Design a protein around this ligand. Sequence first.
Ligand code: ZN
Lengths: 149, 37, 85, 435, 97, 141, 43
Amino acid sequence: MADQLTEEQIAEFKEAFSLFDKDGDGTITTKELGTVMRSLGQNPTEAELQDMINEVDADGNGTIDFPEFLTMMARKMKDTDSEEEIREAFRVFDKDGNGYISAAELRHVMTNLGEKLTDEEVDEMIREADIDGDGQVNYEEFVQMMTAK
Amino acid sequence: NEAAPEKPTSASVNRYILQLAQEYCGDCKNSFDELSK
Amino acid sequence: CCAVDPIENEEDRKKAVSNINTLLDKADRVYHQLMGHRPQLENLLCKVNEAAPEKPTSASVNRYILQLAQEYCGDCKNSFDELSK
Amino acid sequence: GHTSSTKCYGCASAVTEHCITLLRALATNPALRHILVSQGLIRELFDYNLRRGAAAMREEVRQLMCLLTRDNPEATQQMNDLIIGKVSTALKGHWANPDLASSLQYEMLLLTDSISKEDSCWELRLRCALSLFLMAVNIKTPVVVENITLMCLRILQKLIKPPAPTSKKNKDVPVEALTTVKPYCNEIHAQAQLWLKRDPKASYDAWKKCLPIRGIDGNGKAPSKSELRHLYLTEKYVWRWKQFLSRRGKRTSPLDLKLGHNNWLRQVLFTPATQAARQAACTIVEALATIPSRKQQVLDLLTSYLDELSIAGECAAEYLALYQKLITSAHWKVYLAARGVLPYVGNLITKEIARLLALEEATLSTDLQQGYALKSLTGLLSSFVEVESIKRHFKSRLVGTVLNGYLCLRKLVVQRTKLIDETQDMLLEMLEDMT
Amino acid sequence: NLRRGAAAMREEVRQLMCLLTRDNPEATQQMNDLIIGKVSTALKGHWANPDLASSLQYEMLLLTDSISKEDSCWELRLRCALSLFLMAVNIKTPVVV
Amino acid sequence: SQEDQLCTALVNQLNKFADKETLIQFLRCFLLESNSSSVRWQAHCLTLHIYRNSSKSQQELLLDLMWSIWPELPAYGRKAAQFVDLLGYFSLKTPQTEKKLKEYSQKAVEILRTQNHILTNHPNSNIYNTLSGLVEFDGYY
Amino acid sequence: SQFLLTRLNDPKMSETERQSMESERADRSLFVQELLLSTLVRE
Ligand SMILES: [Zn+2]
């Protein structure tokens, strides 16, 4: 799955991992896990970091070595998001599973995020996310929204 | 007011400032006190 | 005149090197002492600029001007002369 | 025998003192405050009584003028307009007359007192202070730096770093633990260019409305794996939705956290006119680096500033003392090493050693600050090296530089000081540690 | 150089500036324009700051020296002096007088 | 606690007997024209306690009397610290209408403006202004 | 000490408003930090 990455990128990832090795065993701790590819020129968020820790550190040891490090990095430079990821985001937005994300579920998710907005603003963003004129976003609308560049 | 630098520590103050102090606080004060009396 | 003993052999060179190191250390100490005066000078400059009237003949001059004269022409001059020597 | 002379200076001065005291007493009533400010009292107190009288009377009129604008935006705007106009008029011809810059101290003192008193019109006074700062931050003349930029930097320093809390509930927690909003990691929503032009869409409340609240973590339960996944992509795609809305709609577009490598920060941090300006700039930049995302850019810019050690030898004493504090942790050192700062420092050391040799060959003049920059750079390299990862990894590329520098320094015979000797000792210790 | 240096250097630069306009109407006009502009700018805010009137002595000394030396551009210097006179003759403040 | 109503009764008696001119003369004689300061402090206390124990109408009458005396302030110079203290306290404590407030503020600002004009055109103003920042002196000789 | 007008400065504040003031100071410090950061961005 990591064959799409050119050899110099593997070399520079090994460079970063080795420089970030503490005890010389080829294994680092997860507290500085952010700093490693954080030092390579990419900019993550804390939710990104905790999700990345969760995905690999299933045993809860909090310690990472090279193969799964390459596993994480191989899924970072991709620009076109995998349709499974977009579909799962659609499902998360579609709490009731009806396939249509009305304003109310959007309000619930935005309040869960901690962000506050007015009813007029969310109605406005919903109506600018609608192409069929029904004022209701669906899977095709979401996909064509995320593919817009 | 011209503040021209002058070349030569209580004696190192500008001579014109010393003259101003002597003329005002030394003589005018005496004259004012006599006049008030 | 400012002159030092001449050098004729190696032990004299060693003595000269040691003496020059000692003189450099003394010069550094005097230099730091001299350059320490500047913050007080700028504080007195800012105070003088306000020109606030003060109530109490050479003693009737403003006290901040007297302090400026004492600090500059009395102490900085001595430090500068020692450093030059 | 109880009547004063008609033309008496002292009696008129005393009447003015009594007038100021009575007006200060009267101003404590809001209605009388409004009537007085409507009479046209601010301009009168600005034009005459600011500079005339004893020092106590001058601070009293400053207090009265501050009080007259306690909660009146129009009065605050009028006072700010007067201050800004006078400062700009003086600063236009500061270059042809130093007194114009040297005779602004009461205006700036009034601004300092106005900002130091917490009131509801703080934003306008902050705008005035920041406008005066950005108008006179690039002037090299020492009188402007001592009389304009210092006061603005002290105002900014007081605003960024508030006093320690005294409430019994918050007697221990630091200032970063009290904010009611959480700034975004990689975005800046405040924009000064629009703010300084009085844009309602770029105000303080508008900025606060765009930031999520700090979640009251009343439950200590560890969120499940699905919860973290949901949080992740919800944040991701909400951000993408907002980005598209800004791209097509009318919502403002936040700026990206990428700092420029040339700025006023470099002017202020190494100014030789005064030291308090450098110290205030150090405090400001230290306060600007709290969340690691901003500390990224702060440390990168400060590393970019590394080449100034030679030009501003002792004036860097503050700057270095901050850099070492910001990289005092191991992971920041190894991050900087990963970005390629070791060859940079080595090249700087070699260049300044070559300059030292070239100067030694030709002339015989003395310099009491010789070797300070080299001493600092070698100490910084040792600081980077002592940690085990970089020492084990970066030894094979730095041996040549260290040995060449040590031999070149040993060649010195006349232009030698204590700093050069200490540098040679540290370089030899480096060589013995690496081999 | 008008305000910096010892008094002898200041009078020397005054003499040099006077000599540079010995028979040049354009140079005389430029010098007069500078003097008039500075005096008017200071006198606009003299009422709110006495130093503005108290810190014009070198400009007026330059004008005095320029007029005191008989040359062919005397009319322009007289015009500058009379304009400054009629601009600041009705002000009661003692510093202006 | 009898002294409270005794003081109230005596204050009402004095207010009943005394007219405007007598109170005006008392103020001018023992708050402004007195060279001593102990007498001025005694008058300050006595005026304050006459004001406190009076009714609203007499309080307004006394405040108006003091605001009528105030324009004569320059003739007394430094001697009117207690007078302006009492005037400020009375104007701050007595509840009063808007027109009276505007009149009072106008009087204060007018006196301030006139004194500023006197200061900035004084023949000796330049000399004193320059001497202030160089020498230390008590009076204007 | 006998002057009445010199005692007019009597500032007092309770505890809840003290927490509110501390939170507001923190918010304003964050705002000025962001505003200063906005001026150093790359152009
Ligand atoms: Zn008098």
